[PDB]
Design a protein around this nucleic acid. Structure first.
Ligand SMILES: [Mg+2]
Ligand SMILES: [Mg+2]
Ligand SMILES: [Mg+2]
Ligand SMILES: [Mg+2]
Ligand SMILES: [Mg+2]
Ligand SMILES: [Mg+2]
Ligand SMILES: [Mg+2]
Ligand SMILES: [Mg+2]
Ligand SMILES: [Mg+2]
Lengths: 208, 157, 61, 169, 294
RNA sequence: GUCUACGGCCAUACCACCCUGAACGCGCCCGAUCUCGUCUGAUCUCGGAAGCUAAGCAGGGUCGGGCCUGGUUAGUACUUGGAUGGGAGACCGCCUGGGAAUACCGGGUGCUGUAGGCU
RNA sequence: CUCUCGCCCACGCAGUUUUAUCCGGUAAAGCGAAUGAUUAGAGGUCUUGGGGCCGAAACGAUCUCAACCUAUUCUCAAACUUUAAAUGGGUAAGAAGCCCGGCUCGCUGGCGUGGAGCCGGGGUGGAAUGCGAGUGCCUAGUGGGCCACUUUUGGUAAGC
RNA sequence: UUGACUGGGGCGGUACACCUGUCAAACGGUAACGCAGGUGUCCUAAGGCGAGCUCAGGGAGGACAGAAACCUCCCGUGGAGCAGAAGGGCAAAAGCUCGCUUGAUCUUGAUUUUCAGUACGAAUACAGACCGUGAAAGCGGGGCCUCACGAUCCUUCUGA
RNA sequence: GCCCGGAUAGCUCAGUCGGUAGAGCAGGGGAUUCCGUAUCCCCGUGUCCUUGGUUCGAUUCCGAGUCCGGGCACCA
């Protein structure tokens, strides 16, 4: 397996797994949520992202080693089932190998040059989040140190950002409790389902 | 190399916009094309029988011939170093009236009548049109209040 | 002994070196390719307008 | 209180599905013609499955449809061999029903070993005055939810006429 | 719990036409029957719209414009009691007598009355009007049944022959007139001049006196109501063909007679329904607060 | 104030459910002798006029679903031209001009042409 | 060679813009919009797959995994797309035009209808900026290219 | 005499004639032994015209019948089919079944596509015959559209 | 150090028709015989390599990974 220097800066167009590729092996990440998936919304208020600084390609294999390095640290200190790690970007980009000498000039040179599939990597934009854990608010200094250990397994530069939302929802943490309180948000497991005031009135009659 | 076939680059442009498929509206056939009418070419994909080529889709020509179901249109084609006044037979569903001269025909109409309005009234109305002049020296009014101080917001991620 | 396949580099500037031209649309375009039944009537309209017309034309004109 | 909005028999349709054609499917059309008095029409397959002995376009079954006054006179034959009882799940979501029998000589047919024994499938659809607009050519329309007939409204009909039993097991 | 019904089938849905969803036309046969071959450039292609209904038949001549079809002249069958045929306004004889009314009224409007009188006596044979030279030409006109199954003896083809005997140049064949033997190839024109004067419904009266007078009162009650007796019926139509050929002009009733305007509901405003909701929300919270504390 | 016949634009007209429908009409409906067509007068075709607005149909209603249209998103994302701009690079900032899209929020909910009838 | 300017308006033309009017499916965006991918839980329950018991047995009675369904949620698409730029493409910006009168026709046809054709007359100032154009003949050399912004394809990368 | 292309040549392969989608950078054009494919046919109907009918799939039911037989209802914007490779297109249809047929005929030009603005091929709009189908307007000179093929010279048969 | 098919009881091997895992050796237990030889019969023994996808159905089909053996082999 070639170094991650070789399959770095996003050069080719996205070349995804479909009926045109048909021969690309499996990603080393196959599971993506590893804390307690069963949690509700109010059990883990704060969340913490690690944010990309540059536009590059992360391998599926580097995302495997990253979440393991974060899963291991947080069961040491926050304890098991006291967190919810979620790796957010998925590998869909197929890299190729022009696998020469399959010490000789004998196979070809660059004659038939288009490669066989070699693995899957993930195209990342600037400011896009990679990993996201969510815990109690008592565990804030364990958020960063989990993701600080996870950032040494990625190429390039990442910044770790404690977010301003409530959990893995999209609503702000200062006014969530004030606004889930009356009607506007209902909790269904690990997320929050917004209800507007423009549907049919019978679901408002089912509420209250 | 690149397969010199008719209907080659048209995965999208001989196709309907979306949710207007099905059989064509009938006013397209109840259109009146005489000689010298400026028409433009937009070939559909429902009628197979007379679609022009992918070279004329979006060009605009001039009718020289009208027949039972189609119209001869003389268009200009950019071939390499020169252009060619080329004539094509196109069925009637693939074209329409270009509105491009109808905003000239209105002015000529309301231009000549306004020209003889200056003969009876005696003026110098200057019917030739002009581009946008620089803005006139006008006057703003900040009545009562005072202007709003805005300043650049700080950076938060 | 491989060569270069196809470019259009330098080709656009030698088109405009002599100035790509409009085709010189000139008054009275010809009737080439107009459908014959319309065309066969119209010259019957031409070979009878000089002959049997001009005594009952100028007195109206 | 509800005038000219009443359940009437729209048609009664019958079939026998034989696994093959030839001799056996032919004299089964003789049976179904004796119940009705009009000639059968031959249905056929469209999936050769190679596990039923079937083949595509091979004439697999016979069926006919009976309307009007003769539909009820074959239906009342069918409700006495089954003894005026159905189950609750013979009443479909659109309201219309069916029950099916075995040994067709339990219905009025005399026996013949050269003919044999076949099983019918009586299937009744229900109707009101106004159901023709879903099958009319010119201005075809849907039926309106207040005019369509329900499962529970056809079983309250089969209790009313024919004094049936629902047998809710 | 069962399957994945629609929920965004409406997001992509493409409705057909206002006139296909209502079911009147087809637009496949309209496109081939209405649009002018455009090296004639303005000359209108004229139709004969024939539509039978329950209790009426409607005959119209229309042509197409781009803002809608234009109708030249129309003839109905509720009008037709004014010429004598007072009852049975959907049978084959009323259909033919509407087509002659629709043909004579048009040529009165265009001034072609004394030319093009057609076939004055009704023989049922294939009459075909031609163009007398020096005068205006025959009115050319094209039939459409629209959406009706044009089997032989369809009464849309009765109104096809009242037109043709009136002087409308309509191309047609005699193959679909009642009186065309299917397995033979002959056209029995005598069956058609029987069929055109309604002796078949006179014989269906005659078949019902001598068999069962009770069914002859169940059906045919309004023939007996005024006076229609099946020997008189063949002359009553023939006395109506004389009447429509001498005055087709269609006077009109002066139609004013009332000034009142209220029958159905107006669409309530935004504010009138926005406060209906706050009215409903009020009644829900007063039954949950009060009637569950008590 | 609406309808029928024929239409133009083709969801602001559709879908689902619920109320209302004076008069004309349009319908359901009643029949199978002829015309015609079916395994079946159900459809199609043909004779009617005993019923009925129950359906269709027409109006209206739903904190309606869609569709239509405008705010927000957003001068954001991209982008024309420019620099001996930054930076190991990846790419980023600026000058000069243009300039989107969703979630989310608001408003709408068929218009009319020719001919004819009711009020 | 044909002409245009020598001294209240250029015949004309254009690697340009403005004014209008058409064209397009890339960048972005989208997937709680179709197609193709894909992560998580919550609710619901016909059920089957498999357990837990009241039990000779009974879809008599009670839980769980899964499958399905519904509303949400993460992530994508050169050979997907509702939506959709910027740059770009075609046309138009008058006298070959506009209006009026008449007449030919074997084409068209209810029709002094339709449409072309020809003859006669009536009114010239018709976006900005710049420039003199139009045409015809004879014709050599050439038919190995190479580099740079930016856009891109193969390649780990290359003074490829 | 012993082909050419070719990341030297050979071996291999066909990028040697042709079609679809992408590359291709929103007109058109545009390369590599670039990517995913297809062609050297099949069809008297799978051609032509009319009429009738709706498809995939799913739900609830119906003797043997069960995941898969047949019948029936309801839902069904194309999720099926249209000979095939793909794209476009298509619902009283261009799909399915049936009824009649041979326009898959004779003949002169024009035009488009590739383009040098040559040919072959393929296609378009006509016009002059003779016919089909249909009540009719119409539609039809092969296949729903984009590929399905071939000069001089020679031979062969046909035509006045 | 690249490709062609194979991964199955203690072994080995066929078939894993999209619907059971069965020949045969080795051990076990009988029967047979005066007693044994052979023989005969029955029993025992399959994560059918690992996981993912495709239908009341996959070890079987599909295609990933691991493993085992078998191989394309120029003038210089
Ligand atoms: Mg009969
Ligand atoms: Mg009959
Ligand atoms: Mg009846
Ligand atoms: Mg009603
Ligand atoms: Mg009602
Ligand atoms: Mg409404
Ligand atoms: Mg709404
Ligand atoms: Mg720039
Ligand atoms: Mg510079």
């Amino acid at each position: 397996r070639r170094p991650a220097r070789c399959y770095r800066y996003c050069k080719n167009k996205p070349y995804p797994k479909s009926r045109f590729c048909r021969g690309v092996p499996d990603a080393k990440i196959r599971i993506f949520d590893l804390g307690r998936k069963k949690a509700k919304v109010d059990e883990f208020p704060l969340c913490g992202h690690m944010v990309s600084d540059e536009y590059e390609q992360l391998s599926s294999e580097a995302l495997e080693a990253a979440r393991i390095c974060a899963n291991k640290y947080m069961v040491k200190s926050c304890g098991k089932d006291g967190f919810h790690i979620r790796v957010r970007l998925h590998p869909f980009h197929v890299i190729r190998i022009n696998k020469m000498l399959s010490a000789d000039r004998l196979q070809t040179g660059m004659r038939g040059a288009f490669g066989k599939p070699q693995g899957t990597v993930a195209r990342v934009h600037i400011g896009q989040v990679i990993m996201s854990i969510r815990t109690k608010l008592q565990n804030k200094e364990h958020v960063i140190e989990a993701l600080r250990r996870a950032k040494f397994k990625f190429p390039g530069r990442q910044k770790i950002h404690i977010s301003k939302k409530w959990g893995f929802t999209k609503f702000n943490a200062d006014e969530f409790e004030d606004m889930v309180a009356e009607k506007r948000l209902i909790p269904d497991g690990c997320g929050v389902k917004y209800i507007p005031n423009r549907g049919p009135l019978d679901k408002w009659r089912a509420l209250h | 190399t690149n397969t010199k076939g008719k209907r080659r680059g048209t995965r999208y442009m001989f196709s309907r916009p979306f949710r207007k498929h099905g059989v064509v509206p009938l006013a397209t056939y109840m259109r009146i094309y005489k000689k010298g009418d400026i028409v433009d070419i937009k070939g559909m994909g429902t009628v197979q029988k007379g679609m022009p080529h992918k070279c004329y889709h979006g060009k605009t020509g001039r009718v020289y011939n009208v027949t039972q179901h189609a119209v001869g249109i003389v268009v200009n084609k950019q071939v390499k170093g020169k252009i060619l006044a080329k004539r094509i037979n196109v069925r009637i569903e693939h074209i329409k009236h270009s509105k491009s001269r109808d905003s000239f025909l209105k002015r000529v109409k309301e231009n000549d009548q306004k020209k003889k309005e200056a003969k009876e009234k005696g003026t110098w109305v200057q019917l030739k049109r002009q581009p946008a002049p620089p803005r006139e020296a006008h006057f703003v009014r900040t009545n009562g209040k005072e202007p709003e101080l805005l300043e650049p917001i700080p950076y938060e991620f | 002994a491989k060569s270069k396949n196809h470019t259009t580099h330098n080709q656009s500037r030698k088109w405009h070196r002599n100035g790509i031209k409009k085709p010189r649309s000139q008054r009275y375009e010809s009737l080439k390719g107009v459908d014959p039944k319309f065309l066969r009537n119209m010259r019957f309209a031409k070979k009878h307008n000089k002959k049997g017309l001009k005594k009952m034309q100028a007195n109206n004109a | 209180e509800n005038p000219m909005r009443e359940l009437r028999i729209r048609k009664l349709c019958l079939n026998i599905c034989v696994g093959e054609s030839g001799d056996r499917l032919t004299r089964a059309a003789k049976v179904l013609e004796q119940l009705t008095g009009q000639t059968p029409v031959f249905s056929k397959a469209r999936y050769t499955v190679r596990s039923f002995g079937i083949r595509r376009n091979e004439k697999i079954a016979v069926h006919c449809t009976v309307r009007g006054a003769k539909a009820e006179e074959i239906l009342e034959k069918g409700l006495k061999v089954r003894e005026y009882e159905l189950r609750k799940n013979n009443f479909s979501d659109t309201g219309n029903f069916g029950f099916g029998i075995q040994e067709h000589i339990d219905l009025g047919i005399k026996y013949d070993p050269s003919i044999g024994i076949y099983g019918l499938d009586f299937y009744v659809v229900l109707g009101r005055p106004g159901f023709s607009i879903a099958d009319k050519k010119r201005r075809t329309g849907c039926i309106g939810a207040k005019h369509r007939i329900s499962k529970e409204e056809a079983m309250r009909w089969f209790q009313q006429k024919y004094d049936g039993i629902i047998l809710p097991g | 719990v069962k399957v994945v019904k629609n929920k965004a089938y409406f997001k992509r849905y493409q409705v057909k036409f206002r006139r296909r969803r209502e079911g009147k036309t087809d637009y496949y046969a309209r496109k081939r029957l209405v649009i002018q071959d455009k090296n004639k450039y303005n000359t209108p292609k004229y139709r004969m719209i024939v539509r039978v209904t329950n209790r009426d038949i409607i005959c119209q001549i229309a042509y197409a414009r781009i803002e809608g079809d234009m109708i030249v002249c129309a003839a109905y069958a509720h009008e037709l009691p004014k010429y004598g045929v007072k009852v049975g306004l959907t049978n084959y004889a009323a259909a033919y007598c509407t087509g002659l009314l629709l043909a004579r009224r048009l040529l009165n409007r265009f001034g072609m009355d004394k030319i093009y009188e057609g076939q004055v006596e009704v023989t049922g044979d294939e009459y075909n009007v031609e163009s007398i030279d020096g005068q205006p030409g025959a009115f050319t006109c094209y039939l459409d049944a629209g959406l009706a199954r044009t089997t032989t003896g369809n009464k849309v083809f009765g109104a096809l022959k009242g037109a043709v005997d009136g002087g409308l140049s309509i191309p047609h064949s005699t193959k679909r007139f009642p009186g065309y033997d299917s397995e033979s190839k002959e056209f029995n024109a005598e069956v058609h001049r029987k069929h055109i004067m309604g002796q078949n419904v006179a014989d269906y009266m005659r078949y019902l006196m001598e068999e069962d007078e009770d069914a002859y009162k169940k059906q045919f009650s309004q023939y007996i109501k005024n006076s229609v007796t099946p020997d008189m019926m063949e002359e009553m139509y023939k006395k109506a063909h004389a009447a429509i050929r001498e005055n087709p002009v269609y006077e009109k009733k002066p139609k004013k007679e009332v000034k009142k305007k209220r029958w159905n509901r107006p669409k309530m405003s935004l504010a009138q329904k926005k406060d209906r909701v706050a009215q409903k929300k009020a009644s829900f919270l007063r039954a949950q607060e009060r009637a569950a504390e008590s």
